[PDB]
Amino acid sequence: YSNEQEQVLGQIVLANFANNEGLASQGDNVWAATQASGVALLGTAGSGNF
Amino acid sequence: LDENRNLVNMQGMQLTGYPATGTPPTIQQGANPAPITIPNTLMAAKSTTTASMQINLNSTDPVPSKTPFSVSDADSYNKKGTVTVYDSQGNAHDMNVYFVKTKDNEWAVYTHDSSDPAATAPTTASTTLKFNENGILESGGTVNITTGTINGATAATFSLSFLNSMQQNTGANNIVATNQNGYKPGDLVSYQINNDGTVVGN
Amino acid sequence: GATAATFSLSFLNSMQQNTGANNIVATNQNGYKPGDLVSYQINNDGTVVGN
Amino acid sequence: SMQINLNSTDPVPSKTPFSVSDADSYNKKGTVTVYDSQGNAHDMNVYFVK
């Protein structure tokens, strides 16, 4: 901002799956979770499994 | 893998092997086969019970000029050693071990804790060490050490060892090895398969 | 508090002829202080030797 | 073991009694360094007199 002010509008989430190769591809370069692929398990890019 | 975090082949049959049981878990060659599963549950910390260090002492070290021991002055103690200790909750204790050379072939070991605001500054002698004619340690190297409670967690009681340490002249005091048996809780990251069939998780 | 080193000193193969000025040409000892392991190496004889 | 060369024409020192810090008390002075069990260095001064 013009007044030397910084604001945060959010953070991008990351999802790690307990099992890959279960994400069925859907048309364009995206994947849809299903059975044998686990829940999204949302996380943060800071530290951990991400 | 699969939804249940099991090692499964491409067609959908679970893989079996020797199950791992115990604390710490270890492989058993005398148990019946069971399916192998990679758990995702976080592991808990284990209190440090046996810590061992190796300190090389100097025979040519003169006795400190200041007769009374002091905790706020470096010249009061000949050697300082920092050791990491883990309690039952996960708190880290930076235990300070002070070596003082009072006379010939005799050493006084003092223990202090820095992470505890209520910890008492050491004044008396906690351990007495005497070496052989050639500087070989003989006895008295195992000490029962208890830290200070913090955050309502019980203090950790363990055995501190200075075995395999010699006072032969090496120029300056040096610590060559330091080990303990405590770890903070971790999180599942990755798994690898060795050539012995064992699965090791980082 | 360390026992003294009780060694044996030898002057074998000594020269008494006039050489102008007396000088030290050979002196050694069999006692060594503990030294740290600088490195290791292998020579052409197949042996592994540490210095 | 050590080797020392003796001067055949070197006269007897004038000061017959032996001293520790007198140059004329002895003909030659040498030092030998030995190590004990604890590793401490011991210096032995060897004095050669006629």
Side-chain angles (χ1 to χ4, degrees):
Chain A
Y1 289 88
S2 298
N3 43 10
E4 289 282 350
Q5 302 304 319
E6 310 295 340
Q7 297 187 353
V8 283
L9 299 84
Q11 189 177 30
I12 173 61
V13 301
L14 294 185
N16 266 344
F17 298 88
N19 174 31
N20 295 332
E21 300 92 18
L23 301 187
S25 300
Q26 298 290 349
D28 36 355
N29 41 21
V30 298
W31 289 272
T34 172
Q35 304 296 144
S37 62
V39 301
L41 213 169
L42 59 152
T44 312
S47 298
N49 194 24
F50 310 88
Chain B
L1 303 86
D2 52 349
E3 178 183 357
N4 315 125
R5 304 300 306 274
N6 303 328
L7 264 301
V8 188
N9 70 327
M10 191 60 59
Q11 278 66 33
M13 266 61 65
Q14 308 173 358
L15 169 59
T16 45
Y18 288 142
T21 51
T23 54
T26 183
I27 196 60
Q28 175 59 221
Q29 301 182 4
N32 40 19
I36 165 185
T37 288
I38 294 183
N40 197 20
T41 305
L42 310 183
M43 60 175 176
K46 197 265 296 180
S47 305
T48 308
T49 62
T50 297
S52 57
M53 299 90 63
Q54 304 186 19
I55 302 94
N56 197 342
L57 304 178
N58 295 121
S59 53
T60 63
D61 167 60
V63 183
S65 184
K66 291 188 176 184
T67 37
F69 173 71
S70 181
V71 73
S72 302
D73 217 1
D75 57 358
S76 179
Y77 53 88
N78 292 114
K79 186 57 178 181
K80 182 213 307 176
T82 56
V83 183
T84 305
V85 180
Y86 295 87
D87 67 333
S88 302
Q89 184 185 8
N91 303 268
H93 308 271
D94 181 18
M95 295 301 298
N96 294 322
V97 177
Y98 305 145
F99 292 86
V100 182
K101 186 172 183 176
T102 64
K103 63 194 62 57
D104 307 331
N105 300 331
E106 161 60 37
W107 297 84
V109 172
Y110 309 143
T111 172
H112 184 47
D113 198 324
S114 178
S115 60
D116 308 326
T120 301
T123 304
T124 58
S126 181
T127 309
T128 297
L129 296 185
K130 291 184 176 60
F131 294 90
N132 202 21
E133 175 184 336
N134 305 22
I136 298 179
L137 182 60
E138 182 182 359
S139 62
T142 55
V143 198
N144 298 337
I145 301 299
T146 302
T147 62
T149 169
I150 42 187
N151 301 116
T154 61
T157 69
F158 55 92
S159 70
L160 206 65
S161 180
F162 309 97
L163 189 139
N164 194 22
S165 171
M166 301 178 182
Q167 65 170 2
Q168 301 179 359
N169 181 27
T170 180
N173 292 329
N174 294 119
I175 302 179
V176 300
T178 291
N179 186 16
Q180 44 78 24
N181 55 329
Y183 52 89
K184 56 184 176 302
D187 55 343
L188 193 68
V189 174
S190 60
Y191 29 72
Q192 176 270 352
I193 293 179
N194 299 261
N195 63 336
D196 63 351
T198 58
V199 285
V200 171
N202 310 331
Chain C
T3 57
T6 60
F7 65 93
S8 58
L9 183 54
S10 50
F11 304 143
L12 194 145
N13 189 24
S14 178
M15 183 179 181
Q16 201 265 351
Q17 301 184 2
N18 180 23
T19 178
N22 303 330
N23 48 12
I24 299 178
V25 301
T27 168
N28 63 92
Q29 76 293 337
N30 293 24
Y32 60 94
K33 58 178 179 297
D36 299 2
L37 181 62
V38 183
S39 54
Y40 60 94
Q41 64 171 356
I42 305 94
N43 36 336
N44 299 116
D45 60 3
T47 64
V48 282
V49 285
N51 57 330
Chain D
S1 300
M2 71 89 54
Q3 306 175 1
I4 180 61
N5 299 333
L6 299 180
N7 185 268
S8 58
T9 61
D10 179 65
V12 180
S14 180
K15 295 186 180 180
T16 303
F18 185 82
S19 180
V20 61
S21 301
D22 183 71
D24 198 15
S25 178
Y26 48 88
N27 296 100
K28 193 61 178 179
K29 175 183 177 179
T31 168
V32 179
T33 306
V34 301
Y35 294 144
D36 52 0
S37 296
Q38 293 284 356
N40 308 288
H42 293 169
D43 304 331
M44 182 66 56
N45 301 150
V46 179
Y47 308 96
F48 310 91
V49 83
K50 182 174 181 179

mmCIF file of all heavy atoms in Angstrom, chain B residues 69 71-72 111-113 118-124:
data_model
loop_
_atom_site.group_PDB
_atom_site.id
_atom_site.type_symbol
_atom_site.label_atom_id
_atom_site.label_comp_id
_atom_site.label_asym_id
_atom_site.label_seq_id
_atom_site.Cartn_x
_atom_site.Cartn_y
_atom_site.Cartn_z
ATOM 1 N N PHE B 69 33.545 -22.259 44.765
ATOM 2 C CA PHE B 69 32.912 -22.429 43.465
ATOM 3 C C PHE B 69 31.906 -21.316 43.207
ATOM 4 O O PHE B 69 31.195 -20.872 44.114
ATOM 5 C CB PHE B 69 32.219 -23.786 43.377
ATOM 6 C CG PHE B 69 31.414 -23.970 42.123
ATOM 7 C CD1 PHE B 69 32.040 -24.121 40.898
ATOM 8 C CD2 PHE B 69 30.030 -23.983 42.170
ATOM 9 C CE1 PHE B 69 31.303 -24.288 39.742
ATOM 10 C CE2 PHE B 69 29.286 -24.149 41.015
ATOM 11 C CZ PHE B 69 29.924 -24.301 39.801
ATOM 12 N N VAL B 71 28.952 -19.964 40.109
ATOM 13 C CA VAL B 71 28.203 -20.337 38.915
ATOM 14 C C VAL B 71 28.178 -19.222 37.874
ATOM 15 O O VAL B 71 27.913 -19.494 36.694
ATOM 16 C CB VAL B 71 26.769 -20.754 39.296
ATOM 17 C CG1 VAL B 71 25.935 -19.538 39.675
ATOM 18 C CG2 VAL B 71 26.110 -21.547 38.172
ATOM 19 N N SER B 72 28.466 -17.983 38.267
ATOM 20 C CA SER B 72 28.408 -16.843 37.362
ATOM 21 C C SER B 72 29.766 -16.454 36.792
ATOM 22 O O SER B 72 29.847 -15.476 36.043
ATOM 23 C CB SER B 72 27.789 -15.636 38.077
ATOM 24 O OG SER B 72 26.494 -15.940 38.566
ATOM 25 N N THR B 111 26.182 -30.285 38.810
ATOM 26 C CA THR B 111 25.067 -30.340 37.874
ATOM 27 C C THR B 111 24.189 -29.110 38.052
ATOM 28 O O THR B 111 23.956 -28.667 39.181
ATOM 29 C CB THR B 111 24.245 -31.620 38.072
ATOM 30 O OG1 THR B 111 23.052 -31.555 37.281
ATOM 31 C CG2 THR B 111 23.876 -31.804 39.540
ATOM 32 N N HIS B 112 23.718 -28.552 36.937
ATOM 33 C CA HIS B 112 22.821 -27.407 36.979
ATOM 34 C C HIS B 112 21.848 -27.497 35.813
ATOM 35 O O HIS B 112 22.132 -28.157 34.810
ATOM 36 C CB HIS B 112 23.602 -26.086 36.927
ATOM 37 C CG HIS B 112 22.742 -24.867 37.055
ATOM 38 N ND1 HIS B 112 21.772 -24.738 38.026
ATOM 39 C CD2 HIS B 112 22.709 -23.720 36.336
ATOM 40 C CE1 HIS B 112 21.177 -23.566 37.899
ATOM 41 N NE2 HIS B 112 21.727 -22.928 36.880
ATOM 42 N N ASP B 113 20.702 -26.834 35.950
ATOM 43 C CA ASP B 113 19.698 -26.763 34.899
ATOM 44 C C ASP B 113 19.421 -25.304 34.566
ATOM 45 O O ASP B 113 19.284 -24.468 35.464
ATOM 46 C CB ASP B 113 18.402 -27.466 35.322
ATOM 47 C CG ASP B 113 17.506 -27.807 34.143
ATOM 48 O OD1 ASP B 113 17.445 -27.012 33.183
ATOM 49 O OD2 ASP B 113 16.862 -28.877 34.179
ATOM 50 N N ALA B 118 13.109 -21.791 38.473
ATOM 51 C CA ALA B 118 13.187 -22.044 39.904
ATOM 52 C C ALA B 118 14.349 -22.953 40.282
ATOM 53 O O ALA B 118 14.460 -23.337 41.452
ATOM 54 C CB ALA B 118 11.874 -22.653 40.406
ATOM 55 N N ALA B 119 15.204 -23.312 39.327
ATOM 56 C CA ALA B 119 16.333 -24.182 39.617
ATOM 57 C C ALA B 119 17.309 -23.501 40.569
ATOM 58 O O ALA B 119 17.529 -22.289 40.499
ATOM 59 C CB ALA B 119 17.049 -24.577 38.325
ATOM 60 N N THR B 120 17.892 -24.292 41.465
ATOM 61 C CA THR B 120 18.834 -23.786 42.452
ATOM 62 C C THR B 120 20.247 -23.829 41.881
ATOM 63 O O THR B 120 20.649 -24.829 41.276
ATOM 64 C CB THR B 120 18.757 -24.608 43.741
ATOM 65 O OG1 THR B 120 17.424 -24.550 44.267
ATOM 66 C CG2 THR B 120 19.730 -24.072 44.783
ATOM 67 N N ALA B 121 20.986 -22.743 42.064
ATOM 68 C CA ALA B 121 22.374 -22.687 41.617
ATOM 69 C C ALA B 121 23.207 -23.691 42.404
ATOM 70 O O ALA B 121 23.132 -23.710 43.639
ATOM 71 C CB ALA B 121 22.932 -21.279 41.788
ATOM 72 N N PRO B 122 23.997 -24.538 41.747
ATOM 73 C CA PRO B 122 24.768 -25.545 42.485
ATOM 74 C C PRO B 122 25.868 -24.908 43.319
ATOM 75 O O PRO B 122 26.544 -23.973 42.882
ATOM 76 C CB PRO B 122 25.347 -26.431 41.377
ATOM 77 C CG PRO B 122 25.430 -25.528 40.193
ATOM 78 C CD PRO B 122 24.248 -24.602 40.297
ATOM 79 N N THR B 123 26.038 -25.424 44.526
ATOM 80 C CA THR B 123 27.090 -24.976 45.430
ATOM 81 C C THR B 123 27.945 -26.122 45.947
ATOM 82 O O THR B 123 29.165 -25.973 46.052
ATOM 83 C CB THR B 123 26.473 -24.209 46.617
ATOM 84 O OG1 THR B 123 25.684 -23.118 46.127
ATOM 85 C CG2 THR B 123 27.562 -23.666 47.533
ATOM 86 N N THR B 124 27.341 -27.268 46.249
ATOM 87 C CA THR B 124 28.067 -28.389 46.821
ATOM 88 C C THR B 124 28.558 -29.333 45.724
ATOM 89 O O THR B 124 28.257 -29.171 44.539
ATOM 90 C CB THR B 124 27.189 -29.146 47.815
ATOM 91 O OG1 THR B 124 25.999 -29.601 47.156
ATOM 92 C CG2 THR B 124 26.808 -28.247 48.981
#
